[PDB]
């Protein structure tokens, strides 16, 4: 539920402290935590909103020049003077122009020419600062079990549903509890402050389009700019790079503006996150969080219910998720009240031997009516198998066939781990971090190597990186030392970072 | 450039490919891609739409 | 016939996609019409049979 079809989900099967299991949530996917005797919980981060940001250093990307003026000095005089020069709303440029006996000034030296033009801005972009406060993560929980078929994607009814919860986390209240009626309460302890390394990201708006932008890229953009919150008529600094004082045949100056500078900023913003904004709040579209899950107060609703003695039917038979798990929807005909559903995966129906794993929980049917509907998902074995539901001589059975082999599963697991590391750094070492001594040392050495690799490299983007990857591959192949091992490892790191895509 | 009335279509996990009737017009930009569907969107199957 | 997929995708003919609604549109416009050139700016269009 909430996770079935996502196609980017991973299971955090296992809990070796009897207690909390660390977990890192991303915008793309969702995490299904399954324990020994505790119901399978599905968690997903939904939206991260930022509100009441402060404003810093807005830039002007479309200039306009109001009125030109110019003055020439007849070479042996003082300097070309305009009273406008002292007004800081005007652009003034001084050059030398040929003069004499044609223009009425008797001498033939070079003279001074000053041209000034009024600078008036047009629509323009604002950067804003994301402080650690005022940042709110919304986390949705849901629970497997008696859920209907549709309830995986329904919109509202959270407070009424009793199996789904919504948790808001802010650095003012990092730790929260989700109260699931009848299942107990699941505790989330999260570190919001170190989520996506904010305090390096400005929120940038141009015209109803908003992005995240690195502080350095923003502070290194050449355009007219004035610091602080705007109002009224501003005082534009660096009133150039939008005004071009081109020269005529050594006798004039013409002042032109560079038009609208907006597509250049759009293509300059290559590799920055998008964002959408409604009202004052802006909801980011990508991030990640690290929440440990105190599952010490999760109970099991189903236990101490007698088995159901009726017949079951397949409404839509089975679906197969991308990851191989099978989702089944069963309809119950009898009326025994709340009772367990006996379900398993078997081969050799003569002797039903449990093969595979049933990843839902103790399946239950909550309602007590004529016909009820429930959904459960189970993890089949790689061979051909039968889905068995029911007890005796009425047990509905289905045939189900899964393609992969255990080696393929291990290979895909290592690939998923590699992608997660490439995306998250050491916080990937914090993914299922029940917490030992090997894991902590792994995280430590990964922190050190990551700091070094980010300081040396990490100023490249998919082509400088691929080129230096090939070059280090060669130089490591043919340098004849232990530096061969050094350079081949550097090549592996860089090229994997590239071809993750 | 300026843009106008967006539209979209999607046709399942195991059917053909989406086709808008506004693809037979030389004034519309159209892009075709894959989306995750199944058990929460309306079509029972779980591949890529 | 029963045809193996990857033979019903690597076939070079004008291909629609799925829903037949009104006046069809084929996204190929190639491999079934031969634009044979003449000489001295003469151009002719034929179909393959």
């Amino acid at each position: 539920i909430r996770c079935i079809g996502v196609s980017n989900r991973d299971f955090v099967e296992g809990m070796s402290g009897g207690t909390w299991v660390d977990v890192v949530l991303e915008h793309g996917g969702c995490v299904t935590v399954m324990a020994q005797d505790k119901p399978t919980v599905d968690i997903e981060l939904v939206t991260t909103t930022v509100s009441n940001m402060a404003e810093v250093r807005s830039y002007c990307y479309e200039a306009s020049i109001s009125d030109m003026a110019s003055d020439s000095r007849c070479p042996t005089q003082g300097e070309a003077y305009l009273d406008k020069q002292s007004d800081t709303q005007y652009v003034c440029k001084r050059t030398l122009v040929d003069r004499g006996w044609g223009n009425g000034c008797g001498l033939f030296g070079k003279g001074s020419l000053v041209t000034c033009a009024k600078f008036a801005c047009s629509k323009k972009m604002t950067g804003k600062s994301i402080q650690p406060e005022n940042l709110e993560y919304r986390i949705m929980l849901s629970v497997h079990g008696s859920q209907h078929s549709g309830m995986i994607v329904n919109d509202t009814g959270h407070e009424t549903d009793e199996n789904r919860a919504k948790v808001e986390i802010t650095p003012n209240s990092p730790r929260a509890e989700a109260t699931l009626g009848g299942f107990g309460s699941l505790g989330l302890d999260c570190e919001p402050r170190t989520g996506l390394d904010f305090s390096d990201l400005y929120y940038l708006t141009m015209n109803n389009k908003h992005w995240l932008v690195h502080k350095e890229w923003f502070h290194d953009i050449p355009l007219p700019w004035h610091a602080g919150a705007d109002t009224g008529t501003p005082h534009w600094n660096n009133k150039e790079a939008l005004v071009e004082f081109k020269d005529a045949h050594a006798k004039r100056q013409t002042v032109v503006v560079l038009g609208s500078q907006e597509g250049a900023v759009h293509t300059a913003l290559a590799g920055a996150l998008e964002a959408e904004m409604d009202g004052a709040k802006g909801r980011l579209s990508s991030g990640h969080l690290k929440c440990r899950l105190k599952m010490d107060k999760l109970r099991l609703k189903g236990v101490s219910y007698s088995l159901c003695t009726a017949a079951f039917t397949f409404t839509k038979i089975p679906a197969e998720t991308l990851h191989g798990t099978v989702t089944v929807e069963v309809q119950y005909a009898g009326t025994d009240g709340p009772c367990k559903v006996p379900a398993q995966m078997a081969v050799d129906m003569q002797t039903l031997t449990p093969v595979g794993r049933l990843i839902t929980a103790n399946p239950v049917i909550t309602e007590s009516t004529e016909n009820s509907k429930m959904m459960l998902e189970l993890d089949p074995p790689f061979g051909d198998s039968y889905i068995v539901i029911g007890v005796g001589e009425k047990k509905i059975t289905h045939h189900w066939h899964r393609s992969g082999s255990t080696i393929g599963k291990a290979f895909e697991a290592t690939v998923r781990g590699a992608k997660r590391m490439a995306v998250l750094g050491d916080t990937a070492w914090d993914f299922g971090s029940v917490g030992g001594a090997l894991n902590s040392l792994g995280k430590g050495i990964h922190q050190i190597f990551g700091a070094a690799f980010k300081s040396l490299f990490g100023g490249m983007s998919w082509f400088s990186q691929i080129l230096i990857g090939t070059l280090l591959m060669w130089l490591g192949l043919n340098t004849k030392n232990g530096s061969i091992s050094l350079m081949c490892l550097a090549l592996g790191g860089v090229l994997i970072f590239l071809s993750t895509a | 450039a300026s843009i106008s009335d967006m539209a979209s279509d999607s046709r399942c996990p195991t059917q053909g490919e989406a086709y808008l009737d506004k693809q037979s017009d030389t004034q519309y930009v159209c892009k075709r891609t894959l989306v995750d569907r199944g058990w929460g969107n309306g079509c029972g199957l779980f591949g890529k739409g | 016939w029963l045809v193996h997929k990857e033979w019903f995708h690597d076939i070079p003919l004008p291909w629609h996609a799925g829903a037949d609604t009104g006046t069809p549109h084929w996204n190929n416009k190639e491999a079934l019409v031969e634009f044979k050139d003449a000489h001295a700016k003469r151009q002719t269009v034929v179909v393959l049979g």
Partner: antibody
Amino acid sequence: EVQLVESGGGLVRPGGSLRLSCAASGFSYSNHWMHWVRQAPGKGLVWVSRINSDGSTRNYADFVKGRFTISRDNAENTLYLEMNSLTADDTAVYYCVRDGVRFYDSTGYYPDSFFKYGMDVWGQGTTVTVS
Amino acid sequence: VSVSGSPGQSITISCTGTSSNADTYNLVSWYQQRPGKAPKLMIYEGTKRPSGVSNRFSASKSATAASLTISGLQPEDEADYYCCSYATSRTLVFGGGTKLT
């Protein structure tokens, strides 16, 4: 129960513009498809247009060659139908319709081909007179 | 266009589209409009009847037409009946309507 209320219908000259509105309450408006249908005086029902929850997909009948523009605001539970270059053939009662059958798909976004439907929740309709 | 009936009898209104994929009638919906009243739907998905609509109304469908059957006619039943379905994948179209007296 859900109640739909039309507004904005009135007399206008041929070639004029007119903006019809529909107010909804009592259900998850942000998740249901919405339809505009019309019925000429003494005539039958004629489907006009439909839109999704978010406003991404908009479908219009053949008789509207871009004259109509359907839109909505989920936060305000409001539906709008802009109309330009009115003629006499469009003088009729316009009914605002809720689409709950799609709400199979509780999102109301994905516009599958030939998806199941049936229109039971209608507004009272507003009269437009092009005279 | 119209059908006449006596109290207690059964009447069938047919809906036919010409050469439409031989699929369409699976999704035909039937709507009732009493004189001066807002239209009410009696049938959707071809044969499924909503809750609250009387069991008096029934529906059937084939590869060539759809039929709406009202048994035990009552004076209330006199109204205009309209069938609707897809013209193409993105469209909807209402039938010519039948006035049942």
